[PDB]
Structure 1
Amino acid sequence: MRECISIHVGQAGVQIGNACWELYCLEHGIQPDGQMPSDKTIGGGDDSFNTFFSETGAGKHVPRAVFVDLEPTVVDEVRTGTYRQLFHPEQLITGKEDAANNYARGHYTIGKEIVDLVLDRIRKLADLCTGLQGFLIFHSFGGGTGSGFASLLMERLSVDYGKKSKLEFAIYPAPQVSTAVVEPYNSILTTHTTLEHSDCAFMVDNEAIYDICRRNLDIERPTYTNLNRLIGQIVSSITASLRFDGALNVDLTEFQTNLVPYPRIHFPLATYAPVISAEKAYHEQLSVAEITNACFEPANQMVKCDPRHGKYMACCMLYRGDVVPKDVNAAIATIKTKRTIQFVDWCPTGFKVGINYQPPTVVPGGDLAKVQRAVCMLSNTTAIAEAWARLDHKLDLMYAKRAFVHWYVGEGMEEGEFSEAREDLAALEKDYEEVG
């Protein structure tokens, strides 16, 4: 029981899976070739790997995840690197060609002739384990496969399963800083068709975590490997309660019932408080009463939307490590008693607490330090209404003279799809300001 299936779409999703699964193989004793060490284990009895690994006859722990990328070029390395004996060979699905920053190519033309194979593999994964709790799909927004093929899979997963959980992380474009020119098109077209097929989307940007790797980790000029390990750290701290004992356990069907008031308001941003270096932790004591406060700092937060101007709607504190409930409740009362955290008038409760009994694990090579306390606040706030406004202002600028449209309408896409996508994104912007 207590199982989870992780879906890894796109370059961002398939490079996150090369670092989050390193952490997964490091929490338990999983060697990079999918086995326990020489003995270093019992003759059976342990079942904490049941959520993410499947137990076979010879003792191999095969992950229950699917790697999908229309580009072959990135999955070629997870199948040839140091983790080539861990992944099941048919869990790594690749095709002919990439989508090349096109929603149309990943959604209509090249999307269809791989969807059936991916769904067959999801079927083969689902009957392998009895009690399935939900799906953890990670992809991107500015690309072509993470934006198109993943959004095509949301339609194929909400009909076959129904009431299963759909949790998103979904690498989101940064405000000042971008990578591709046409990415407002793909971002709007993938937020138009993924509204009623998901219920939790944990937005992060690649700029705020760059600034965080300049805050706390004492590194200069980081790269994506210093990014995906932090992402996978918060991923494992979200689902730490399924496999480890604790005081207040939180399952996968809990974030929807708390963080989602309205079906169109399901975008809680994440935050990992005790991001720190080993040197910077040598002069600070890691207590509950500052990791509680570090989550509400604009410095430690994700997407730079200035949450002083926002209104908090629903928070979900997931504590980890050496924690007693007394200082947790004292710190929560402290941060409640302060005025500068604006809370909306119709949520007098506002908090959800989950306490585990396991300290986080550290990786050899990551600049994160060994600590005793860790939280991950998935906070839902109105401050991302500015994010959508500055995201679709770029579409308003680009669509005003029909730039880059001929690559879309020339391949399986209709001209009327753009207008209704901007229209319902405007509806999503309109309903966000009437909840404040």
Structure 2
Amino acid sequence: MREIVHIQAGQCGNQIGAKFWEVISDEHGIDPTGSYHGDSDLQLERINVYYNEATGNKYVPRAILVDLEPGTMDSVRSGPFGQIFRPDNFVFGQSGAGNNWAKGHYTEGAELVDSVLDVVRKESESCDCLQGFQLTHSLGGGTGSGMGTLLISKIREEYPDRIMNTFSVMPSPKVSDTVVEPYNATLSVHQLVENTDETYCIDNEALYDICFRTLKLTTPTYGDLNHLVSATMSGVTTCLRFPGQLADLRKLAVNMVPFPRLHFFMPGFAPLTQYRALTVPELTQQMFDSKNMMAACDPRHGRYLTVAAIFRGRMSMKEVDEQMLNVQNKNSSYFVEWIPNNVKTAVCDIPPRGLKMSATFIGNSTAIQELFKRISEQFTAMFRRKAFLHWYTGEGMDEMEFTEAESNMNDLVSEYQQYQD
């Protein structure tokens, strides 16, 4: 359990993926040229989890960049850390996917998928002991959603005994590009239910609400949302990247997922982005507050199955334990009783950039059903009139596939309701 192979697909997937590599490269002291210029040795102890070491003492991210149009990857290559990626790991087409799940999954994506698999195989073959894969994408478009899920299925066929982890961005009419996003998202959620072990649900509605209401941004852009996403991604990979007392993707899945289908996690972060450091009780209170959640679901409308929480910075372990036990004991009604000791706490001495202390939250909560309900409703309102279906039947799909996707989604919702009671 050492190496992780990272994959980023489509516009959203490549933009948040680029930000992720920029942030964690800064944390491990890796410059844009791939040279280490850090001060501590803790940044290099587990750097091979995400980086290959090339001769000349260079570190190259183990990352694969995928898209059906070249624009976003062109902007990545010219980005701040664009030079650090392996040039052969850029795999792209020209047609695009038109915000259409069928084009990404069945027609345009099928041509490029074998090239992607060749690069994945080349990266996996150099791994001393591969753990699995992490994929960044959105569910509302065409390439990340359709071709991304196609890729997950093919990878599972070739590597059935490795972990599959995703960061999946959920659409919202408040931050919307096209009216067909509920169709694409509903088709993708069934794929994720079958073929991932862990999925972090990043809701664009919650990201917008945080930028508008909390960060006091009258007009949030995609960059403002991606600031929150990259902070969260660094937080949740901290314990994979640094000497931890525990982590790896399989022990994460084993400890967080009591039932195979219910593996959709609600993440959170504190403090939300000044010179004053937050105290431990403030970190703990904010980290459990709904306003710090990245999925637009009220945790007081459901129950926690399992929780993992990471504290970063130099602080008192005793105070952290006292505060975590405090919030559990004072909010014990929102934790299931039939899983004893279901809250795990970790501490890392290295804080992220520009913060003296921070806290990251990973919750497996039944309140996530609200997210799926929202999408289900938006699907049905259109599907009962078959509105916009010709974009999909024109690519060879039948109405029956939509009926089955909808039924599968409502089944997932009812399963969450089953364990909530």
What TM-score do you get using the length of structure 2 for normalisation? Answer: 0.93
Shift of 1:340: 7.3
> Which residue of structure 1 lines up, in the alignment, with residue 257 of structure 2?
260
Residue 319 of structure 1 pairs with residue 299 of structure 2: no
Specify whether residues 217 and 13 from structure 1 end up closer, same or farther in structure 2 by C-alpha distance, changes over 3 A only.
same
For structure 1, the residue ranges without an aligned partner over 5 or more in a row are 363-369
Distance of 1:173 and 1:245 partners within structure 2: 35
> Which residue of structure 1 lines up, in the alignment, with residue 138 of structure 2?
140
Asked if structure 2 preserves the Cα contact closer than 8 Å seen for 1:249 and 1:355, the reply is no
Name the aligned partner's letter for residue 143 of structure 1. Answer: G
Root-mean-square deviation over aligned CA pairs: 2.2
Name the aligned partner's letter for residue 345 of structure 1. Answer: E
Residues 389-416 of structure 1 show CA distances to partners (whole Å, capped at 9, x for unaligned) of 1211111111111111111112132322
> Which residue of structure 2 lines up, in the alignment, with residue 213 of structure 1?
211
Distance of 2:14 and 2:20 partners within structure 1: 10
Distance of 1:81 and 1:353 partners within structure 2: 36
Asked if structure 2 preserves the Cα contact closer than 8 Å seen for 1:292 and 1:331, the reply is yes
Distance of 2:158 and 2:315 partners within structure 1: 41
SS at match of 2:140: coil
Q: Aligned residue pairs: how many?
A: 419
Specify whether residues 195 and 339 from structure 1 end up closer, same or farther in structure 2 by C-alpha distance, changes over 3 A only.
closer
Q: 2:381 aligns with which of 397, 408, 416?
A: 397
Shift of 1:341: 5.2
Residue 423 of structure 1 pairs with residue 407 of structure 2: yes
Asked if structure 2 preserves the Cα contact closer than 8 Å seen for 1:91 and 1:121, the reply is yes
Q: How does 1:179-194 map to 2 (within 5 A)?
A: 179-194=177-192
Residue 242 of structure 1 pairs with residue 234 of structure 2: no
> Which residue of structure 2 lines up, in the alignment, with residue 154 of structure 1?
152
Distance of 1:423 and 1:214 partners within structure 2: 35
Stretches of 4+ aligned residues off by more than 6 angstroms = none
> Which residue of structure 2 lines up, in the alignment, with residue 365 of structure 1?
none
Residue 383 of structure 1 pairs with residue 355 of structure 2: no
Q: 1:298 aligns with which of 290, 306, 311?
A: 290
Specify whether residues 76 and 164 from structure 1 end up closer, same or farther in structure 2 by C-alpha distance, changes over 3 A only.
same
Asked if structure 2 preserves the Cα contact closer than 8 Å seen for 1:308 and 1:340, the reply is no
Shift of 1:6: 1.1
Residues 61-100 of structure 1 show CA distances to partners (whole Å, capped at 9, x for unaligned) of 2110011011211111122344342111111111021111
Distance of 2:219 and 2:384 partners within structure 1: 37
Residues 301-335 of structure 1 show CA distances to partners (whole Å, capped at 9, x for unaligned) of 12222222111111011222213331122112211
Distance of 1:396 and 1:47 partners within structure 2: 50
Q: How does 1:32-431 map to 2 (within 5 A)?
A: 32-36=32-36, 46-174=44-172, 177-214=175-212, 217=215, 219-246=217-244, 248-276=245-273, 278=274, 281-282=275-276, 285-339=277-331, 342-360=334-352, 362=353, 370-431=354-415
Shift of 1:125: 0.7
Distance of 1:194 and 1:41 partners within structure 2: 41
What TM-score do you get using the length of structure 1 for normalisation? Answer: 0.90
Residues 92-136 of structure 1 show CA distances to partners (whole Å, capped at 9, x for unaligned) of 111021111111100111111111110000011112221222211
Distance of 1:61 and 1:405 partners within structure 2: 47
> Which residue of structure 1 lines up, in the alignment, with residue 418 of structure 2?
434
Name the aligned partner's letter for residue 344 of structure 1. Answer: V
Asked if structure 2 preserves the Cα contact closer than 8 Å seen for 1:28 and 1:49, the reply is yes
Specify whether residues 85 and 371 from structure 1 end up closer, same or farther in structure 2 by C-alpha distance, changes over 3 A only.
closer
Shift of 1:214: 4.1
Asked if structure 2 preserves the Cα contact closer than 8 Å seen for 1:175 and 1:387, the reply is no
Asked if structure 1 preserves the Cα contact closer than 8 Å seen for 2:69 and 2:93, the reply is yes
SS at match of 2:5: strand
> Which residue of structure 1 lines up, in the alignment, with residue 5 of structure 2?
5
Shift of 1:227: 2.4
SS at match of 1:242: helix
Shift of 1:222: 3.2
Distance of 1:221 and 1:70 partners within structure 2: 30
- Select between 421-430 and 78-87 the one with higher mean Cα deviation: 78-87
Asked if structure 2 preserves the Cα contact closer than 8 Å seen for 1:171 and 1:203, the reply is yes
For structure 2, the residue ranges without an aligned partner over 5 or more in a row are none
Shift of 1:250: 2.2
Identity of aligned residues (%): 40
Residues 13-39 of structure 1 show CA distances to partners (whole Å, capped at 9, x for unaligned) of 1001221111122112222122346xx
Name the aligned partner's letter for residue 170 of structure 1. Answer: S
SS at match of 1:239: helix
Distance of 1:415 and 1:215 partners within structure 2: 40
Structure showing the higher helix proportion among its residues: 2
Specify whether residues 396 and 210 from structure 1 end up closer, same or farther in structure 2 by C-alpha distance, changes over 3 A only.
closer
Name the aligned partner's letter for residue 165 of structure 2. Answer: L
Residues 186-234 of structure 1 show CA distances to partners (whole Å, capped at 9, x for unaligned) of 0111112221211111111223223323455465533222322332222
Asked if structure 2 preserves the Cα contact closer than 8 Å seen for 1:311 and 1:383, the reply is yes
Name the aligned partner's letter for residue 383 of structure 2. Answer: Y
- Select between 142-151 and 131-140 the one with higher mean Cα deviation: 131-140
Asked if structure 2 preserves the Cα contact closer than 8 Å seen for 1:239 and 1:251, the reply is no
SS at match of 2:195: coil
Specify whether residues 414 and 33 from structure 1 end up closer, same or farther in structure 2 by C-alpha distance, changes over 3 A only.
same
Asked if structure 2 preserves the Cα contact closer than 8 Å seen for 1:9 and 1:146, the reply is yes
